[PDB]
Amino acid sequence: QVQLVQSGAEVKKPGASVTVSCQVSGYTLTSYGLSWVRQAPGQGLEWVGWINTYDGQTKYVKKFQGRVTMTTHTGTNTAYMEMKSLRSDDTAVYYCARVEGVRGVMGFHYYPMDVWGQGTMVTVSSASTKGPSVFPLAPSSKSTSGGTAALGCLVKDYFPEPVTVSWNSGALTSGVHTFPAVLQSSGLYSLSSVVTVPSSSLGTQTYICNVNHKPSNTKVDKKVEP
Amino acid sequence: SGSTYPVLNVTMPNNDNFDKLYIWGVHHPSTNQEQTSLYVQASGRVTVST
Amino acid sequence: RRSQQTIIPNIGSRPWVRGLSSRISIYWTIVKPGDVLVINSNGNLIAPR
Numbered sequence: 210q211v212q213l214v215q216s217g218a219e220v221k222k223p224g225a226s227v228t229v230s231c232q233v234s235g236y237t238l239t240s241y242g243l244s245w246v247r248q249a250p251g252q253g254l255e256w257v258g259w260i261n262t263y264d265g266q267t268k269y270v271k272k273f274q275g276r277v278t279m280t281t282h283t284g285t286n287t288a289y290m291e292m293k294s295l296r297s298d299d300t301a302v303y304y305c306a307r308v309e310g311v312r313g314v315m316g317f318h319y320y321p322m323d324v325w326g327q328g329t330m331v332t333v334s335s336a337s338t339k340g341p342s343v344f345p346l347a348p349s350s351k352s353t354s355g356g357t358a359a360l361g362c363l364v365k366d367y368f369p370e371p372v373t374v375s376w377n378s379g380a381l382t383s384g385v386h387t388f389p390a391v392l393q394s395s396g397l398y399s400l401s402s403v404v405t406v407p408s409s410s411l412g413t414q415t416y417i418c419n420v421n422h423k424p425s426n427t428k429v430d431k432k433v434e435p
Numbered sequence: 436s437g438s439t440y441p442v443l444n445v446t447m448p449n450n451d452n453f454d455k456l457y458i459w460g461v462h463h464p465s466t467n468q469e470q471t472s473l474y475v476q477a478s479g480r481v482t483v484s485t
Numbered sequence: 486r487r488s489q490q491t492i493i494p495n496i497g498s499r500p501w502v503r504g505l506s507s508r509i510s511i512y513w514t515i516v517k518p519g520d521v522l523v524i525n526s527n528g529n530l531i532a533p534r
């Protein structure tokens with residue numbers, strides 16, 4: 210029962226820098242090694258750096274030497290991963306797992322990394338934060354297809370993902386299906402949340418998507434009616 | 436304090452990442468009256484522990 | 486028959502561990518051939534098997 214707390218997913222422009230933090234529960238990180246692996250979106254995995262608590266040893270990838278750097282707070286039972294002068298491409302998911310290569314070993318090889326951290330999502334894009342535009346989407350005509358009707362909302366041109374859409378503060382949890390946002394050639398995402406409510410109530414009950422964006426602090430509620 | 440010396444019991448965590456060095460001590464009364472007076476109960480006792 | 490060791494329990498609250506604010510002091514006593522061992526405790530004893 211060893212847990213790993215990873216710093217809240219962060220996002221920063223290229224050239225800027227971020228720092229991932231890893232926590233440990235149960236076995237003190239001190240008597241365990243550690244390494245970090247990047248997980249580019251559907252790109253496979255790539256080992257990056259390696260540190261050894263109570264051993265102050267460090268080994269990095271020939272590729273990002275200098276740019277990245279390890280750290281360890283033996284006092285708080287948490288490890289750190291520093292990345293300066295970030296690069297647009299480098300953005301991806303990052304993890305931190307245990308390693309046996311400690312003390313006399315020094316070398317990582319032998320050890321079979323165990324217990325990976327939930328992860329940290331970092332992003333690098335010259336696109337600055339934006340406020341989501343909420344526009345209502347109702348049937349062009351009573352759908353009457355199979356059953357009921359499909360009405361929803363459309364948040365377009367917003368960064369950085371994602372913003373939680375809540376129909377009537379959660380009064381409408383039935384039928385709601387928010388489709389995965391998409392990266393516009395412009396550089397700003399866009400998602401949609403549609404619901405399946407009876408076509409016999411297109412005028413009995415109104416619907417409002419509570420699009421609340423933390424990045425832009427933009428709370429926009431919209432009404433959806435034919 | 437006053438007419439009583441409650442069994443003192445406190446704690447202090449070492450959040451900091453560096454080793455802490457606490458220097459304490461125990462008093463050796465020269466007389467019983469000095470003991471019972473300065474420390475109430477005649478039998479003192481210190482129990483530092485990590 | 487050679488050496489002598491006497492310990493006294495130290496009542497008091499201490500750093501909590503595995504759900505306990507108590508502790509157990511470990512002490513070893515070697516007994517040479519022919520010599521004999523003896524244990525005279527009033528309590529708080531943790532005799533070996």
Ligand SMILES: *[C@@H]1O[C@H](CO)[C@@H](O[C@@H]2O[C@H](CO)[C@@H](O[C@@H]3O[C@H](CO[C@H]4O[C@H](CO[C@H]5O[C@H](CO)[C@@H](O)[C@H](O)[C@@H]5O)[C@@H](O)[C@H](O[C@H]5O[C@H](CO)[C@@H](O)[C@H](O)[C@@H]5O)[C@@H]4O)[C@@H](O)[C@H](O[C@H]4O[C@H](CO)[C@@H](O)[C@H](O)[C@@H]4O)[C@@H]3O)[C@H](O)[C@H]2NC(C)=O)[C@H](O)[C@H]1NC(C)=O
Nearest residue numbers: 261262263264265266267268281283311312313314315316
């Ligand atoms: C066989 O195994 C052993 C053990 O696994 C291994 O020994 C390690 O060897 C590596 C490299 O040879 C050492 O790593 C280097 O450490 C440099 C200095 O920092 C470390 O050493 C400090 C002092 O060194 C001495 O320590 C005691 C005396 O104090 C003595 O017994 C040793 O022999 C040694 O001479 C040491 O104080 C420090 O750690 C302290 O502080 C931490 C802080 O939290 C604490 O937790 C510890 O308990 C301890 O008090 C630290 O370990 C360091 O400068 C050097 O850096 C390299 O990389 C940078 C870039 O990152 C470069 O700029 C630089 O040029 C160096 O290339 C490197 O990290 C390591 O110290 C040895 N011991 C350890 C920790 O395992 C042998 O090498 C193995 N045999 C071989 C050769 O295969």
Ligand SMILES: *[C@@H]1O[C@H](CO)[C@@H](O[C@@H]2O[C@H](CO)[C@@H](O[C@@H]3O[C@H](CO[C@H]4O[C@H](CO)[C@@H](O)[C@H](O)[C@@H]4O)[C@@H](O)[C@H](O[C@H]4O[C@H](CO)[C@@H](O)[C@H](O)[C@@H]4O[C@H]4O[C@H](CO)[C@@H](O)[C@H](O)[C@@H]4O)[C@@H]3O)[C@H](O)[C@H]2NC(C)=O)[C@H](O)[C@H]1NC(C)=O
Nearest residue numbers: 234235444445446447497498499500501502504505506507
């Ligand atoms: C003399 O002075 C000392 C000064 O320290 C004084 O304090 C003693 O300190 C210890 C620890 O330092 C104290 O113990 C704590 O007790 C709480 C309360 O336990 C009750 O409630 C829990 C649920 O909350 C029940 O399960 C349990 O049955 C009890 O009813 C514990 O909650 C503490 O442990 C957890 O909480 C801590 C605080 O948030 C966490 O930091 C810690 O990680 C613990 O987490 C647990 O759950 C995790 C779940 O994710 C798990 O992962 C962890 O592994 C872990 O199990 C803590 O034990 C206690 O108050 C004092 N001990 C004594 C002596 O009683 C002394 O009391 C004082 N002497 C006296 C009696 O006068």
